[PDB]
Amino acid sequence: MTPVIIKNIECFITRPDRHNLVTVRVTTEQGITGHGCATFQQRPLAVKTLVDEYLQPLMIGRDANNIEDLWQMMNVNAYWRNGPLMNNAISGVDMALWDIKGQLAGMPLYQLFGGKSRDAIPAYSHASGETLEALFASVDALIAQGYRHIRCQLGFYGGTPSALHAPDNPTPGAWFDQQEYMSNTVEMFHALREKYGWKLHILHDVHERLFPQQAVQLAKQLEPFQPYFIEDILPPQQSAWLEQVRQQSCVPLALGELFNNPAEWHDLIVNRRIDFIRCHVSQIGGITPALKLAHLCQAFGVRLAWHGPGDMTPIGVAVNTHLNIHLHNAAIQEFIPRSATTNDVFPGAPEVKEGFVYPPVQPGIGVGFNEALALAHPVLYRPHEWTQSRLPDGTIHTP
Amino acid sequence: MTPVIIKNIECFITRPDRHNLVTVRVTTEQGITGHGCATFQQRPLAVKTLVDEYLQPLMIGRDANNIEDLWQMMNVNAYWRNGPLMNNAISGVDMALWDIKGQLAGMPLYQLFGGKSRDAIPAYSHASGETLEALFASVDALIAQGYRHIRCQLGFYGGTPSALHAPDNPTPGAWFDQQEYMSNTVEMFHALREKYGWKLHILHDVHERLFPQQAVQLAKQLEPFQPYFIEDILPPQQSAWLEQVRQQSCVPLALGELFNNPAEWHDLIVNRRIDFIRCHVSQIGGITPALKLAHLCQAFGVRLAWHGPGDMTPIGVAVNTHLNIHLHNAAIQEFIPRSATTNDVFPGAPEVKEGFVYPPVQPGIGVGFNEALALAHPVLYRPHEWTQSRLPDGTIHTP
Amino acid sequence: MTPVIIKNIECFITRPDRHNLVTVRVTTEQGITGHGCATFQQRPLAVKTLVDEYLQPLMIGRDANNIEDLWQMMNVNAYWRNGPLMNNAISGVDMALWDIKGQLAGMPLYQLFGGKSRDAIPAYSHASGETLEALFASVDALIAQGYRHIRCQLGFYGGTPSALHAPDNPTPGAWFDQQEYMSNTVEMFHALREKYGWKLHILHDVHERLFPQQAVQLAKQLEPFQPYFIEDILPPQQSAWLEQVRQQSCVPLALGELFNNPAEWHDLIVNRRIDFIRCHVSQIGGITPALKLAHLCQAFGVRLAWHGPGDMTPIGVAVNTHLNIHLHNAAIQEFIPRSATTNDVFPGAPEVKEGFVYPPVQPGIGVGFNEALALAHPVLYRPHEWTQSRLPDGTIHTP
Amino acid sequence: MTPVIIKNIECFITRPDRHNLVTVRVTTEQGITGHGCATFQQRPLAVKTLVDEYLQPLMIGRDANNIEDLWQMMNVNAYWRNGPLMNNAISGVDMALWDIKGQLAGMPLYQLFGGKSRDAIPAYSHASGETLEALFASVDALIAQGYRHIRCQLGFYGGTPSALHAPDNPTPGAWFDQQEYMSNTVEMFHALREKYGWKLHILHDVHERLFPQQAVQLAKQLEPFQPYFIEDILPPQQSAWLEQVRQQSCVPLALGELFNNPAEWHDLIVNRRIDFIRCHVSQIGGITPALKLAHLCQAFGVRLAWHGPGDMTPIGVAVNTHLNIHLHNAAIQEFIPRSATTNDVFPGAPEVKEGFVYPPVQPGIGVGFNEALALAHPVLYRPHEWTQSRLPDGTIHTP
């Protein structure tokens, strides 16, 4: 085995469908090309600045074989470290180097890690509706596709202040009522169990909409309906309050899509305050740290449910899958279907078949990047008005 | 009082001396201009991308008076949040908004907060030398300047691997030996006490050079010499080990210049694991969060020593001072002297006089920004080779 | 900005309605007058003695700009410190000094702090009745006024011992039966949910009527009815028992109107034993310490519901509002309507409009003091017989 | 036994020597008169306001026999409670009622409690000097009087800012240097042991002069010299830091003269963070609560050293003595000698004989109050400039 020398590092932003996606391409003197995900959809241009202006000049000429040293070196390179942007930039490169290693080995990524610990990972997808009739139709469509796990939301939260009892001269934002959200959610589970029975796995994402006592209360109220998990019941800065949620309820708890600093997960895992970890692999710095995190989780009996939104390249989807097929403590793959155009730009990403995602068969990650087609779909500025989440008195809440 | 409407938000990178500095300028329809610090010296272009491409379009047209709502809104605006880039971008705007409020009030910033807690804040600066003779000359100069607090380092750490017993074919980086660093530091404190006696306040920055047991050992070894503080004895990710340092030594402990996420400081403050907090105000999101942090520290008897390196605009220096004059638990201001050119680009920043920094007298922050002189001193790419810190076997260490 | 020199400090006791109110007036050589609340209704003459005999001679001639130094100095000035009288005296002066700073800045108080966090603060008020019919009429009136949050009490507790099974020769006092109080309160919540449904926010003040196990039991019994909070479930000296309440119930818990020493709140906040803090701002030493407390609460996810009874000047009402508009973690403003005469003596205080209190617009606190009308309504001695609270065997209980 | 009916309650302020002393006289219809201490020397007129305007009208006509009910009733009577003033007012009355009970029983107070648990209590007094020669003379005089326990201070702390390296335009106050205080104290113990040897019991009062790490450091530095106790090493609000002091040093710790709220002592005692409790009996509400506190202390092996300054009536001195002769866990009586005039106003108080204070022999407290002579010595306003304690940068410190 000889040094595999990094020739260039490029970053592309492409919007084939709804989201600005960020891809890193690492090329080598040997002609082996790797691709990675660096998608932070809300701040893509800054991710590109980091790759083009900093990581490129740092990395060219180095030996790609040594992913571990390179990860450790990149991680501390700006002295100050961690955070959504820093971690996403590194992730793109880290994933791309693992892709290269897979190709050089002639093995799918998960086979490098040590191979399968299951025949396929279960998947869930998203169901929603403003009314029960609409929600039911959404659930019915996913059941017809063969999903056994479905994440369900009733109602939509965050519109005009005039839709509730707001103050005079309200500040613009996405306004909602936590009480309405809570009671609608409880009613939703009850109606879902009445219609669909007790075998369907029902997930629900609270999406940090609540104050600590509200989370405690909601957890107790949803317990009779046996959710598969209740996700992001609290924002990361209030995670100590999970101790009280645990004192009051046995609902499975999932948390962590927002994490981008190890200080956020350490005490959570060590005190067994969650059942499933939800980290976005690119937010935590890529495959290298995800493997260590998965093992830390295993030692405390915590299971894996990595974040798999539409705001992620199919490269990222594929990486979740490799991790899910290999790691013994993996539980479930959140999965959002992709457009034809998205598949054309990034060919080769896993698909769900009757609620399961199977082991990938190509060497490395197994997802390409059609640069020419990526040009046809440039970055578009989006306001993301939902992040300006306001309570009924106009208070900003964690969105 | 009437709404003060944001007209524009600009970001400038300027290098009047050694460091790439980043400054945010907020202009208003009313013609009141504010300036803030967003200096993350190792990644300035990315900070600029964030301000120009994201915060500018978000913020134009909003009422500048409501700093608290705007801080809360900006903080969660990209959903993912915290981290060095995101926080520095918001800092720039937050500081500029406080600058505007002081001007509108006709009061120095610290008078807005509720006015003075002290007549002047003590200051320290940096002394170093590769030999004791060199260190002594450097210390003598600062004593002649009237400093009563001096941060001292003996030797320099991070050069060619051929200076150590390194392996064959060593990887490039800044190589050092922890054992050499430790014994030189112990020798240094002994020699400084022999030469200068026991009234001089002597500070020392470990700069995360050590593994946990080494930190414990060094703290015990330095105890007899009564340091004013021992700073960054452990990297953020090993801060739990401060429990062991506390069990073994009464040395004062300072930590936190690296912080950019509240999960890094919460448990350390609550468990009284530090005596001084060292946060870089722009790294934690500006004045707004620094006030709340200062008050959280107060409730636990923790004192303040905000980061004040050369890699910070004089705007940042001034803000440290305002905070230091007001906050009852402020302890000391790290101070690094500035060149004529730096002062010309950012006129009005505080100066140290016989070891003290005095209350500013102008309204707002009291620091301007000479745009034309700034444009004459553009950004320069720097490799920052010291961040590639390697131990005697080649291992990356936290730099 | 120039020194603003304290010319005099005066204290007035006035009873425009039902309660003895205490107000501090700070006059300056510059002619800017500030007013503060020092209302401890049960001991007003002693507050006046403190201000007239001690704080006046201490304070005359000092620079009013430096609120922080003056607060710290006054706080420790008698060596012994804290407690209801000492803190109310200092509050009066502290608030008046903040009033002065707002006027000097030309800004409403909350704008000094950094401006708005919300468009308006929600408000609640008090409903009561000895029968359900009476309670319902009282609740209906507040709902017609636009309140969405109502604090409800069924029955009255504390009368002649002959109404209970009391011992022969009972000692005079306000006698009550905890079992009667508990069962009536449970009955009340059930009846209110049957009548008004599940959107109405219903608050209930236990007012330290119970022993520890009774508090635990009542919290569990009230859980199904989803109270907005249950307040003062335990007296300050038994607050450790909140650990047991938490183990047994998810009801929201409010505490702290009785606090006047930081040792009362520290452990309760740090251990997340409350959801809302209820401190009377003047009882904790004024605006200066209330800001630090609000921020300490914030770090632990505790929300604010400052005490707002009729025994507080409208100056105090206004200060609650300024704090409530600014502080991000403020939740609700307890509001009691004021007579024409009260408004005439203290003009400018906030009014509730359809369940909201809005940002004040005048500089400073925005509340004046009609001295001549104040002198027309002098102090009246009151026995406050309810503070002599006795159980069915004659035992004094915390009232 | 028949009801003993309270006829009047009076309060006198008298200054026979250096301090404003406060005495409460309770007269009865039966003609048995009791006296109590309510001395809060820094705020005497407010104590008198409380007694004359509030406790007098509350208490007349009640049965004095029932001290426990009356204590409990007075304690909660203003709803808000605890604090130096409230507690001192109640103490005066409480002590006076115990005095009456003693007289009615024909027994010295300590005999009511259950009699002696020692033949005499050891005493200490205060030695001081600016220089060692002066300190030694002071110690020599106390040794010649037969003291075996002596509280020693070297140097005086708190004078003009020009005596140290203070900032320009220093704020008036009592300025000192914690470093100077610390090193002088260490030198003092060393020199005391060299001169006097190792049998003399040496006490030292830190008087909350230090920051937490300074306390930890000083505790370690004084350990070799085997102090009898080190008193008030930390202010009450930083008492959690005693955990670190305990981790680092075996010096006996004494704390509590400042206490006037049970929240201040509870966690301290329960976690065995002190060896001696130092409460001022009148600050904690008199004999009734002191007895309960002493028993709480006993269950955790904490010993008693009640505060016995010159700012206490000889009635208070006598009460300390009764408590000290009876309570098994009493350790030592701080004692400051009294002038002829002081003894003439309050005849009958205990004296020290060869380092011991003996059991009192008269019924009740055994100390009278000569009202006519008390007139010859009225209240005098004093500034107490030492409470305005400033550090070298001008910061207020707990005095």
Ligand SMILES: [Cl-]
């Ligand atoms: Cl970042």
Ligand SMILES: [Cl-]
């Ligand atoms: Cl809604």
Ligand SMILES: [Cl-]
């Ligand atoms: Cl486990």
Ligand SMILES: [Cl-]
């Ligand atoms: Cl503390």
Ligand SMILES: [Cl-]
């Ligand atoms: Cl300078």
Ligand SMILES: [Cl-]
């Ligand atoms: Cl929290």
Ligand SMILES: [Cl-]
């Ligand atoms: Cl009103």
Ligand SMILES: [Cl-]
């Ligand atoms: Cl008091």
Ligand SMILES: [Cl-]
């Ligand atoms: Cl001194």
Ligand SMILES: [Cl-]
């Ligand atoms: Cl024990």
Ligand SMILES: [Mg+2]
């Ligand atoms: Mg989610």
Ligand SMILES: [Mg+2]
């Ligand atoms: Mg440092």
Ligand SMILES: [Mg+2]
């Ligand atoms: Mg209440």
Ligand SMILES: [Mg+2]
């Ligand atoms: Mg003392």
